[PDB]
């Protein structure tokens, strides 16, 4: 037993990380088959990114201006197009240790693993959630652009996030692997602020189920609630409502632990209206909400990917 913030095995993605250098700017690229994906601000200098000209700076760059480098080997760029905020650099050699992969645009609440890279080398891996304001509580330094967030599905690596920038508040914004930002954010060093965002209710409930599996069950009560009377309370507390779907996603955890979904909702309701009474659940003094129902299943059932 024991329940930790657990990330996917990164081996399949690590083989795809390459260094992309344009001028003096050096940041990471994702090498899948014969195409390299990277933030489009690899072409920017220090001077022109308070408000950058992305299609003039792209004109003056040719294929040879781009160093794509996989470890000890250089990759020949044979073509470059710009789709939204990502560059697609076509290289002459298909990555040999490209995995089964697909591109997904996630919805707020879904959790992915971030392979934090610098200078084309993977540095660290950790789990993040897609907050409803389309930001991520991440940990990136300058040079982390190009790092990708991913999930592992049916031996198929779902690429869902590429890191681009840090908002002034400390949170981070990025794009999907097709170049469209998540949220209203734009790749520029201007005043941008994260919007109001909600505590992912279905993920708190999945976390509560994982605590009961691990033996934390002091918050269980005699009481049940209705779905919508629970929704009431969740409304006022920046918890966003529980749909019938959310009840259906939580079903498997419910069937495993034998506790009805509305029984947790009663326990969660006066976790909100009372506070945790100084006690901790799974080692946290907060209500942690970065665990999707699959995240709990895969960590508690011992699901492996290989």
């Amino acid at each position: 037993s024991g329940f930790r913030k657990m990330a996917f095995p990164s081996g399949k993605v690590e083989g795809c990380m390459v260094q992309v250098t344009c001028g003096t700017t050096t940041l990471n690229g994702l090498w899948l088959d014969d195409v390299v994906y990277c933030p489009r601000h690899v072409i920017c200098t220090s001077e022109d990114m308070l408000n950058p000209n992305y299609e003039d700076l792209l004109i003056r760059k040719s294929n040879h201006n781009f160093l794509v480098q996989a470890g000890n080997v250089q990759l020949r760029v044979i073509g470059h197009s710009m789709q939204n905020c990502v560059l697609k650099l076509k290289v002459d050699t298909a990555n040999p240790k490209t995995p089964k992969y697909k591109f997904v645009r996630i919805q707020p609440g879904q959790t992915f693993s971030v392979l934090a890279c610098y200078n084309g080398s993977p540095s660290g891996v950790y789990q993040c959630a897609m907050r409803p304001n389309f930001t991520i509580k991440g940990s990136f330094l300058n040079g982390s652009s190009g790092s990708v967030g991913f999930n592992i599905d049916y031996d198929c690596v779902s690429f869902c996030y590429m890191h681009h920038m840090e908002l002034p508040t400390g949170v981070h914004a990025g794009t999907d692997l097709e170049g469209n930002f998540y949220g209203p954010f734009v790749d520029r060093q201007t005043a941008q602020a994260a919007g109001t965002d909600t505590t992912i209710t279905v993920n708190v409930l999945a976390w509560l189920y994982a605590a009961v599996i691990n033996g934390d069950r002091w918050f269980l009560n005699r009481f049940t609630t209705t779905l919508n009377d629970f929704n009431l309370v969740a409304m006022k507390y920046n918890y966003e409502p529980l749909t019938q779907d959310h009840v259906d996603i939580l079903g498997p955890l419910s069937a495993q632990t034998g506790i009805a979904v509305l029984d947790m909702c009663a326990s969660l309701k006066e976790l909100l209206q009372n506070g945790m009474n100084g006690r901790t659940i799974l080692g946290s003094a907060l209500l942690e909400d970065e665990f999707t129902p699959f995240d709990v299943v895969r960590q508690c059932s011992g699901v492996t990917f290989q």
């Binding site: 840090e166 908002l167 002034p168 981070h172 520029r188 201007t190």
Partner: peptide
């Protein structure tokens, strides 16, 4: 002032 990383 966002930071491009």
């Amino acid at each position: 002032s966002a930071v491009l990383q």
